[PDB]
Design a binder for this molecule. Structure first.
Ligand SMILES: [Mg+2]
Ligand SMILES: [Mg+2]
Ligand SMILES: [Mg+2]
Ligand SMILES: [Mg+2]
Ligand SMILES: [Mg+2]
Ligand SMILES: [Mg+2]
Ligand SMILES: [Mg+2]
Ligand SMILES: [Mg+2]
Ligand SMILES: [Mg+2]
Ligand SMILES: [Mg+2]
Ligand SMILES: [Mg+2]
Ligand SMILES: [Mg+2]
Ligand SMILES: [Mg+2]
Ligand SMILES: [Mg+2]
Ligand SMILES: [Mg+2]
Ligand SMILES: [Mg+2]
Ligand SMILES: [Mg+2]
Ligand SMILES: [Mg+2]
Ligand SMILES: [Mg+2]
Ligand SMILES: [Mg+2]
Ligand SMILES: [Mg+2]
Ligand SMILES: [Mg+2]
Ligand SMILES: [Mg+2]
Ligand SMILES: [Mg+2]
Ligand SMILES: [Mg+2]
Ligand SMILES: [Mg+2]
Ligand SMILES: [Mg+2]
Ligand SMILES: [Mg+2]
Ligand SMILES: [Mg+2]
Ligand SMILES: [Mg+2]
Ligand SMILES: [Mg+2]
Ligand SMILES: [Mg+2]
Ligand SMILES: [Mg+2]
Ligand SMILES: [Mg+2]
Ligand SMILES: [Mg+2]
Ligand SMILES: [Mg+2]
Ligand SMILES: [Mg+2]
Ligand SMILES: [Mg+2]
Ligand SMILES: [Mg+2]
Ligand SMILES: [Mg+2]
Lengths: 110, 142, 55, 117, 103
RNA sequence: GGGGCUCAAACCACACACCGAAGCUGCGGGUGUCACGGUGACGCGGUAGAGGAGCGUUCUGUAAGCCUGUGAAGGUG
RNA sequence: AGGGGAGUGAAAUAGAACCUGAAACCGUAUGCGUACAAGCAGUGGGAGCCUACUUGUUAGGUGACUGCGUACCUUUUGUAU
């Protein structure tokens, strides 16, 4: 089966988002939703909607059952970043990078 | 036609027993280190352990010549400033008789992981008996 | 003070071998069947089999 | 006639980085470090073709010594007795018989010993 | 049933029905060749140690093919002296099959 | 250099053997010069530097040719 | 916001930041190695394991253990410096 759901340009750093990605890798979608619902991380709130969107795609486009699915693949890739200017002391100027990421979640009933 | 090489899963190891009962320390240790390495077998290869098992029974009766019984010193450092410590041959024989033979053999072996495996096959005891009767060692002269 | 050499890929990944996250203790309220944090009031408003705040 | 360097330069870096396959860290994936690593690897290879001939003769001689002393003779006396009688067999073949054809090795040592050397 | 023969400046311990690579010979493919420089012949437990060579023994072989070994690369580099040189090499060999050993 | 070494594994004499280099020999290849008409003999470490011979890139002629959607250039094995 | 289908198209991994899309750099998956071991990280020797198939004098991937081994350029009488 192995149906997917992607979120492009999520406004969070990839290194921050990968801490939550490997907390749900390989788990059943039933207990993966409980972990994300009660986590204190911001990336867990973002990644929860990608996981529920994948489940909805499974039920509608493929006629699956939520009790049968499990998180088969999850990864976080880097996106494009905004560049800003930070004034420092004595006329010095710094460059600020605001990073983003792509999140892909796949659920499979096998 | 390539040169034969010994495989660690096929080597044949044997047990011998050596008695230090008036033996020169350094001349006894050169034969032990030769057996521990495998130089006495045609199947010797530099990178596998093809040695034998050596048991030494009368460790405390090993002998030295000249005036080395009092003038031979063993030094070690503890890692702290001023932590140099020394002991001579008489006090070490009374305190730890086996450490004399082990120290002499260890310095005649390669200093690498393979050379520490050859050292693991040397058993030194201070009495007249050993606990390795199940392995059935056999006599070895010098 | 700053590095005289830049860290390798392996060197900075061994430092991050302690950055993993732990899970929370979750319980199921048998009266309702709802998942909540252990020793906490459920999002509905139940604790130990009683209504406390009722939204 | 303006000439661009893009195609030729890329085709030349990829040749070096293919030889640096299996090296550690930047030695296999950046050209500046990998170029130095490939040159040093070739330098070692030229030198170690000389040393392979030395390392194997030192291994044949060590095995012949071990197998001659089992028959009651040292290496330096066995070589003197082989020259004395007539035998001109290699050390590579002699070390092969010591490990595999142990009965044939004994007959050679006994033949060399009959030359009283 | 093996033998020791000298060819190409080297010595090879040779058994019957064996393929081995030797230095290049000036013999056409498929032609029979023999080695009268035989040093040792051992038939079972009977060994004939060859004073110079074993008298009467000969090893019969036939040429299988010709070819070149894998390329080795020579580099000559002198650091901070502005010198470098490269070279390639493939060595010729002749593959022979050992038909029969006559002691 | 270390282990360790005392009728030595030290020193002084003599003797025979062996190990030991990219030195020499053996076998197989490549090149420079000279001589003879492919063979001989005698070379082939190298910075500054001198001399000789080549590879590859873009454009012009050959080319109103030849190749190419039954797949060009480019990229990756 | 972003996606999963469905449709247009010869081709959407040609979807508008849209021809091709390399390198640095960052990930997921599989195979092998790595927690008693000292140093320019290679090279010579070399077991074991995995894959493929011509079922072992073969090919490909790893490299336990071991001999040797102090980057490159410049400037200098002379540099691991
Ligand atoms: Mg200001
Ligand atoms: Mg930064
Ligand atoms: Mg060493
Ligand atoms: Mg640093
Ligand atoms: Mg510095
Ligand atoms: Mg560390
Ligand atoms: Mg951390
Ligand atoms: Mg490797
Ligand atoms: Mg790469
Ligand atoms: Mg000699
Ligand atoms: Mg040599
Ligand atoms: Mg020479
Ligand atoms: Mg020649
Ligand atoms: Mg020259
Ligand atoms: Mg020369
Ligand atoms: Mg095509
Ligand atoms: Mg062009
Ligand atoms: Mg269509
Ligand atoms: Mg494409
Ligand atoms: Mg396209
Ligand atoms: Mg782009
Ligand atoms: Mg176009
Ligand atoms: Mg594109
Ligand atoms: Mg890339
Ligand atoms: Mg990683
Ligand atoms: Mg992995
Ligand atoms: Mg230890
Ligand atoms: Mg270990
Ligand atoms: Mg270290
Ligand atoms: Mg050390
Ligand atoms: Mg190898
Ligand atoms: Mg292989
Ligand atoms: Mg290695
Ligand atoms: Mg090594
Ligand atoms: Mg070294
Ligand atoms: Mg200066
Ligand atoms: Mg100066
Ligand atoms: Mg430096
Ligand atoms: Mg120097
Ligand atoms: Mg420096």
């Amino acid at each position: 089966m192995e149906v997917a759901a992607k979120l492009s340009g999520a406004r969070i750093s990839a290194q921050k988002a990968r801490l939550v990605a490997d907390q749900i890798r390989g788990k059943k979608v039933g207990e993966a939703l409980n972990l994300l619902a009660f986590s204190s991380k911001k990336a867990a709130e973002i990644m929860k909607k990608v996981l529920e969107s994948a489940v909805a795609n499974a039920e509608h486009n493929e006629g699956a059952d939520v009790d049968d699915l499990k998180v088969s693949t999850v990864f976080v890739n880097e996106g494009r970043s905004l560049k800003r200017i930070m004034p420092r002391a004595k006329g010095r100027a710094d460059r600020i990078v605001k990073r983003s990421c792509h999140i892909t979640v796949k659920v499979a009933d096998k | 036609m390539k040169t034969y090489t010994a495989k660690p899963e096929t080597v044949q190891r044997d047990w011998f027993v050596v008695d230090a009962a008036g033996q020169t320390l350094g001349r006894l240790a050169t034969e032990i280190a030769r057996r521990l390495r495998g130089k006495h077998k045609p199947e010797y290869t530099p990178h596998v352990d093809t040695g034998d098992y050596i048991v030494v029974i009368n460790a405390e009766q090993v002998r030295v010549t000249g005036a080395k019984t009092t003038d031979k010193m063993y030094y070690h450092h503890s890692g702290f400033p001023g932590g140099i410590k020394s002991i001579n041959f008489e006090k070490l024989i009374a305190k730890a008789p086996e450490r004399v033979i082990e120290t002499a053999v260890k310095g005649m072996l390669p200093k690498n992981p393979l050379g520490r495996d050859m050292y693991r096959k040397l058993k030194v005891y201070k009495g007249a008996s050993h606990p390795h009767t199940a392995q059935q060692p056999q006599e070895l002269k010098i | 003070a700053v590095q005289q050499n830049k860290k390798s890929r392996s060197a900075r990944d061994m430092r991050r071998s302690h950055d993993a996250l732990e899970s929370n203790a979750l319980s199921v309220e048998k009266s309702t069947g709802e998942v909540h944090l252990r020793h906490h009031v459920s999002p509905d408003g139940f604790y130990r089999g009683r209504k406390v705040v009722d939204k | 006639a303006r000439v661009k360097r893009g195609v030729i330069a890329r085709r030349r870096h990829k040749k070096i980085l293919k030889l640096a396959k299996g090296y550690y860290g930047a030695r296999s994936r950046v050209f500046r470090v990998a170029k130095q690593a490939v040159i040093k690897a070739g330098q070692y290879a030229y030198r170690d073709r000389r040393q392979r001939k030395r390392q194997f003769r030192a291994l044949w001689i060590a095995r012949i010594n071990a197998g001659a002393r089992q028959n009651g003779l040292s290496y330096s006396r066995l070589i003197a007795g082989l020259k004395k009688a007539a035998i001109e067999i290699d050390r590579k073949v002699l070390a092969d018989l010591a490990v595999n054809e142990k009965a044939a090795f004994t007959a050679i040592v006994e033949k060399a010993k009959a030359s009283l050397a | 049933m093996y033998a020791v023969i000298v060819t190409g400046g080297k010595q090879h311990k040779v058994t019957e029905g064996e393929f081995l690579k030797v230095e290049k010979l000036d013999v056409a493919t498929g032609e029979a060749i023999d080695f009268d420089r035989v040093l040792l012949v051992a038939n079972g437990e009977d060994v004939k140690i060859g004073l110079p060579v074993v008298e009467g023994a000969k090893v019969t072989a036939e040429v299988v093919s010709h070819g070149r070994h894998d390329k080795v690369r020579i580099i000559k580099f002198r650091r901070r002296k502005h010198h470098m040189k490269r070279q390639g090499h493939r060595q010729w060999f002749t593959e022979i099959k050992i038909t029969g050993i006559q002691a």
